[PDB]
């Protein structure tokens, strides 16, 4: 008939390639992993002016997909006994002791239920001093633990606490501990000089090339398609890893509460599988992403589940999704933002069509 690598290439061509013309995207990397086999598709240019093709070495910004690595770092520290998720941040950032934010526990920060943390840090919050002062000045609003409000500050504080508990700067926790444990050799918080030639330009909505530190746990990671597929492989096969990181990965798969059809895990969003397309689109709706929503306890603990996460920066888009019981996952990286719904729909059509 037709070899499987060609079949998957055709499906990615049918569902992802048209997005390049439709949204004027310079470069894209799409990868599928199925039964521990990797399929990689590279399109377009990492740098338009340099005529450098997207390839297996191309480095992209992950945006909020970076939180998946922060979540994994948190599970690692927890299962190593460096933190408990019932701890409060002042136990580790002592300057926050005796402040309102010291009533919020680590799980609540990691899953956005402090009750009064906005999507972004204020533009004027730049230094670690202004970050500290931002959190000491924080005051509650809604009951802590009651409302989900997607928040970069919230998981940014989580990651700072994780770094403090491991006695290392957060960038070192990832580059010296978590990335090596996961077998990722081309993933970075800070892209070294020797790799700038592989660092894609991001492109804004005029197709112009473009490119605080405590915000790095929320959106500071860069990576390649091979590394992101290895990361998806790790999430599909935690048992293939040492106990410390195996337990860390599993920690990130544990649903913590629900908002309608969405289960909030650590970093990952989780869904009963099979999931309808609308369930997946709802997780990225304005209601869920931009507004507070009352959370509810998990009632149906789904036996068969899937996970995904979108992420964006000014010049980059990312989508990652995996389905443990089908042993399948997909990564999309672009050096131009495209609508999140397009990423989800295209991935849903590929994954459902794959034999």
Author numbering: 1 to 211, 216 to 359
Give me lines lifted from the publication on this model.
Antimicrobial resistance in Acinetobacter baumannii is partly mediated by chromosomal class C β-lactamases, the Acinetobacter-derived cephalosporinases (ADCs). Cephalosporin resistance in carbapenem-resistant A. baumannii (CRAb) is largely mediated by Acinetobacter-derived cephalosporinases (ADCs), class C β-lactamases present in all Acinetobacter spp.. Interestingly, a common alanine duplication (Adup) is found in this region. We previously demonstrated that several ADC variants with an alanine duplication (Adup) in the Ω-loop gained the ability to hydrolyze both CAZ and FDC.
The X-ray crystallographic structure of ADC-33 in complex with CAZ was determined to 1.57 Å resolution. ADC-33 crystallizes with two monomers in the asymmetric unit. In the B monomer, electron density was continuous with the Oγ atom of the catalytic residue Ser64, indicative of a covalent bond in an acyl-enzyme complex. In the A monomer, contiguous electron density to Ser64 was not observed, suggesting either a pre-covalent Michaelis-Menten or post-covalent product complex was captured. The product of CAZ (A1BIM) was added as an alternate conformation to the acyl-CAZ in the B monomer. Electron density for the R1 dimethylcarboxylate group of both acylated and product forms of CAZ was not observed. The oxyanion hole is occupied by an oxygen in both (carbonyl oxygen [O9] of acyl-CAZ and one carboxylate oxygen [O29] formed upon deacylation in product A1BIM), with hydrogen bonds formed with main chain amides (NH) of Ser64 and Ser318. In the ADC-33 complex, the oxyimino portion of the R1 side chain is oriented toward Tyr221. In the ADC-33/product complex, electron density for the R1 side chain dimethylcarboxylate group is not observed, due to its presumed clash with Tyr221. Overall, loop flexibility, displacement of the deacylating water, and destabilization of the acyl-enzyme intermediate appear to favor hydrolysis of CAZ and product release in ADC-33.
